[PDB]
């Protein structure tokens, strides 16, 4: 039926305050609103997560520390480095309220899916997949993805997490490494020195979870066609072997041409094809954002993907709105790939796909 859109002005305002992505939440929503897509969705106000809800995954020691440094923005606390707070995750004033708000939003989205309110629930300000139970990491203070999966499992026996962010979805993968009830699949850049450093194709999970983690290491320069070939190949095999009851999909836009990280060379059309493939499964699906550091392009991407969810074709002209001047010099929705090389060699991609296919054979 009609997708749920997690939103409130207070929520966007809170999400806007994260210093690694200032105002991004407003730009994303403003563009969605400019295309009048919110009128085709069920707008649901996010609840803030309670301490107990956050503690379903995060340790009390970590949560108390976060709450502590959040009071005065103590960035010089003796225990902060142990808790992952530093350059990537500064201890800013109010950061605990921020994290509670995002955790709550993804939980709210998960609850809408449990209650059958919708088949698709969207939280574009979520997807903070790097955070660990006791450690901030990679701009992530709280792992809303894990919290959403833990909520969904109350109802859905097998959950497939698909992570299309530029970076390895390490926090979610590690969390579920030892279970066969949640399968994680991450496509990401994998190169020595590139954050977080994990997620080779040989990383497949541990114990009862062995073969229930799937990683696709990709090199700089990949474009829409090759990425979709890889993603379709993997997801086809995964759907067949795992038979998920629900899906959580992280769609970090740091893969998109024009991102300052300048690694992949994707456009939202290519990501959209991957999304369409997952949507045709007709399963309860929780849609999350993630990275994305060209703010206008991230808005372009997630707006386009929202159009994909709604089955609509959007006008190529960006409508005038609050942030219109950020859309130059072209002022169009489409993104043009950069003219740099694809460093992915066909033989290596094939080897990766062979290896994964062999791994999934054990899944039954």
């Amino acid at each position: 039926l009609v997708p749920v859109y997690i939103y409130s002005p207070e929520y966007v305002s809170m999400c806007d305050s994260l210093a690694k992505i200032p105002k991004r939440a407003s730009m994303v929503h403003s563009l969605i609103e400019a295309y009048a897509l919110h009128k085709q969705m069920r707008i649901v106000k996010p609840k803030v997560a309670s301490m107990e809800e956050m503690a379903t995954f995060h340790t009390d020691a970590y949560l108390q520390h976060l709450q502590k440094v959040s009071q005065e923005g103590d960035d010089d606390h003796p225990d902060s480095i142990e808790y992952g707070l530093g350059y990537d995750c500064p201890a800013t004033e109010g950061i605990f309220d921020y994290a509670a708000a995002i955790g709550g939003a993804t939980i709210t989205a998960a609850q809408c899916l449990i209650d059958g309110m919708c088949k698709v629930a969207i939280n574009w300000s979520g997807g903070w997949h790097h955070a660990k139970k006791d450690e901030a990491s990679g701009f992530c203070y709280l792992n809303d993805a894990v919290l959403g999966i833990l909520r969904l499992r109350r109802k859905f026996e097998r959950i497939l997490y698909v992570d299309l962010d530029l970076h390895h979805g390490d926090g979610v993968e590690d969390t579920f490494s030892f279970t066969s009830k949640v399968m994680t699949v991450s496509l990401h850049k994998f190169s020595p020195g590139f954050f977080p450093g994990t997620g080779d194709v040989s990383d497949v999970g541990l114990g009862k979870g062995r073969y229930y983690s799937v990683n696709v290491p990709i090199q700089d320069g990949i474009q829409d066609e090759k990425y979709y070939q890889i993603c379709e190949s993997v997801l086809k095999e995964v759907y067949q072997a795992f038979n998920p009851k629900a899906v959580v999909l992280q769609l970090g836009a740091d893969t998109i041409a024009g991102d300052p990280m300048c690694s992949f060379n994707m456009t939202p059309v290519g990501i959209g094809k991957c999304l369409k493939y997952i949507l045709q499964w007709q399963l309860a699906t929780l849609i999350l954002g993630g990275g994305g550091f060209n703010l206008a392009n991230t808005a372009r991407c997630w707006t386009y993907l929202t159009g994909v969810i709604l089955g609509k074709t959007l006008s190529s002209e960006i409508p005038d709105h609050e942030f219109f001047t950020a859309y130059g010099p072209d002022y169009v929705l489409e993104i043009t790939p950069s003219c740099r090389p694809d460093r992915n060699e066909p033989h290596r991609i094939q080897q990766i796909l062979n290896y994964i296919k062999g791994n999934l054979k054990h899944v039954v």
């Binding site: 990537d88 790097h130 701009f139 590139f194 954050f195 977080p196």
Partner: peptide, 4 residues
């Protein structure tokens, strides 16, 4: 620990 890498930096992001």
């Amino acid at each position: 620990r890498h930096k992001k």
